[PDB]
Design an enzyme around this catalytic site. Structure first.
Site, PDB file in Angstrom:
ATOM      1  N   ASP A 216      -3.231   9.895  15.534  1.00  0.00           N
ATOM      2  CA  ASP A 216      -3.521  11.319  15.367  1.00  0.00           C
ATOM      3  C   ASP A 216      -2.688  11.874  14.229  1.00  0.00           C
ATOM      4  OD1 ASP A 216      -5.330  11.296  17.526  1.00  0.00           O
ATOM      5  OD2 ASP A 216      -3.716  11.724  18.958  1.00  0.00           O
ATOM      6  N   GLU A 219      -3.490  17.255  15.304  1.00  0.00           N
ATOM      7  CA  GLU A 219      -4.031  17.942  16.472  1.00  0.00           C
ATOM      8  C   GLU A 219      -3.452  19.342  16.361  1.00  0.00           C
ATOM      9  OE1 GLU A 219      -5.954  16.385  18.943  1.00  0.00           O
ATOM     10  OE2 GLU A 219      -5.802  14.405  17.985  1.00  0.00           O
TER      11      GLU A 219
END
Length: 442
Positions: A216, A219
């Site tokens: 990721d 986010e």
């Protein structure tokens, strides 16, 4: 899935830059494809829906195998990108609208290579990945996410011959949550034991989940942001059932093949509440666009070394902004993801170090070495209302306990039915994507 004949598939052109040195880059003529979950699924020789609202047709799909024989996913024509799905491109900028009114909610998309027949796979070890972002219109409860997953380059077409569309139709999605809401897995409709998600008119969960490693990059909304590593054992796309999925609902979050929590660096959660926020006196002002730079450092500084560190810095209006630091008594002031940071911070927070159990930064790096697909998305959270990102999680936890407070959002925020009204016109923009050696992208 079979491919339908009602509409041509037309991905949106999106140029990125591949760089060799600072300000020395060349254009790579890539494109954006919509995830197969958002596609119309209908009979192979007709117009009849195989899936409507949040249910499969039980006559057409009494079993996954029969469903797969009877049904097909169709293309996204250029006109429908903006009109139906809220996706658009201007030059090197990609925009994703949250709600598009027949009413579409959220979107997940992938980067195709220049042939438009395979995902653009990024081998990220000893490289730098950079982009410009605007999350100013995303508030509590929303997430404009940019991340990598260990999908196959052909969406599984070679492994699963019943998958006729491959990357061209946005198939083969998997991630470190081992999601059951994926409609097509291993070339088959995930229609067995399909259950609608209450309060989600468009989504449900099937028998199987689909697991793979996940990195990721981003986010975020305007209130909080995080970057997070999620290794799995193994890292590659793996259809799961039972305990292997690590389902939250059966108490199996830490019993599956993937590290679901991941090892996160989230500035606010790491106890710097003034670094990032919607205003000019935060260090990084989320009301305006900015550049996000990610560097993936190896043990020996080569492509063959083990992944050791995820470094981060920002550029906003020409001002270089180094990452915030971990800010707790007796804890080293880490400003990056490393195995040591993960152990120390999870120790403090009382979080199980499943990251380490799954092989840590080294295992995360093996996924990155093989190559990962780029995902760009906008979504709300029907499970946890995005409280994990931007509020107190658990909601009943003391906000002064390290690890609980992840942002300033109220614990009543992020209810999908509310955010889908209040933030209908939220739009995330990802643009001026750049990829190259460390130090080459700014």
């Amino acid at each position: 899935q079979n491919v339908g004949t009602q509409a041509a598939e037309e991905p949106l052109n999106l140029p990125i830059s591949v760089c060799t040195a600072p300000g020395n880059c060349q254009t790579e003529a890539d494109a954006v494809v919509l995830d197969s979950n958002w596609r119309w699924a209908h009979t192979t020789t007709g117009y009849t829906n195989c899936y409507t609202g949040n249910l499969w047709d039980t006559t057409l799909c009494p079993t996954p195998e029969t469903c797969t024989t009877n049904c097909a996913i169709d293309g996204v024509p250029l006109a429908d990108w903006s009109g139906t799905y809220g996706g658009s491109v201007t030059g090197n900028k990609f925009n994703l609208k949250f709600v598009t009114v027949s009413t579409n909610i959220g979107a997940r998309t992938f980067l195709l290579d220049s042939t438009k027949t395979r995902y653009r796979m990024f081998q990220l070890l000893n490289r730098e990945f950079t982009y410009d972002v605007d999350v100013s219109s995303l508030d509590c409860g929303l997430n404009g996410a940019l991340y990598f997953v260990s999908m196959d380059a052909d969406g599984g077409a070679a492994k699963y011959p019943t998958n006729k569309g491959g990357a061209k139709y946005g198939t083969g999605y998997c991630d470190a949550q081992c999601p059951h809401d994926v409609k097509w897995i291993n070339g088959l409709a995930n229609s067995k034991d399909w259950t609608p998600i209450p309060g989600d008119a468009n989504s449900g969960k099937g028998y199987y989940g689909n697991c793979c490693a996940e990195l990721d990059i981003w986010e975020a909304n305007k209130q909080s942001q995080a970057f997070t590593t999620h290794p799995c054992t193994p890292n590659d796309q793996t259809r799961c059932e039972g305990v292997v999925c690590g389902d939250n609902d059966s108490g199996d979050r830490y019993n599956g093949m993937c590290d679901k929590d991941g090892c996160d660096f989230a500035s606010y959660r790491m106890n710097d509440h003034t670094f990032y926020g919607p205003g000019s006196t935060f260090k990084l002002d989320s009301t305006k666009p900015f550049t996000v730079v990610s560097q993936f450092i190896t043990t020996d500084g080569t492509d063959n070394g083990d992944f050791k560190e995820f470094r981060r810095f920002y550029v906003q209006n020409g001002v270089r902004i180094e990452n915030s630091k971990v800010n707790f008594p007796g804890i080293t002031a880490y400003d990056s993801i490393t195995d040591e940071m993960c152990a120390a911070t999870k120790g403090l927070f009382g979080d199980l170090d499943d990251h380490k159990n799954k092989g840590g930064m080294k295992q995360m790096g093996e996924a990155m070495r093989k190559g990962m697909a780029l995902v760009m998305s906008i979504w709300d959270d029907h499970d946890v209302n995005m409280l994990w990102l931007d509020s107190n999680y658990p909601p009943t936890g003391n906000p002064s306990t390290p690890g609980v407070a992840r942002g300033p959002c109220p614990t009543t925020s992020g209810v999908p039915s509310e955010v889908e009204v209040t933030q209908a016109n939220a739009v995330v923009s990802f643009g001026n994507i750049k990829f190259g050696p460390i130090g080459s992208t700014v």
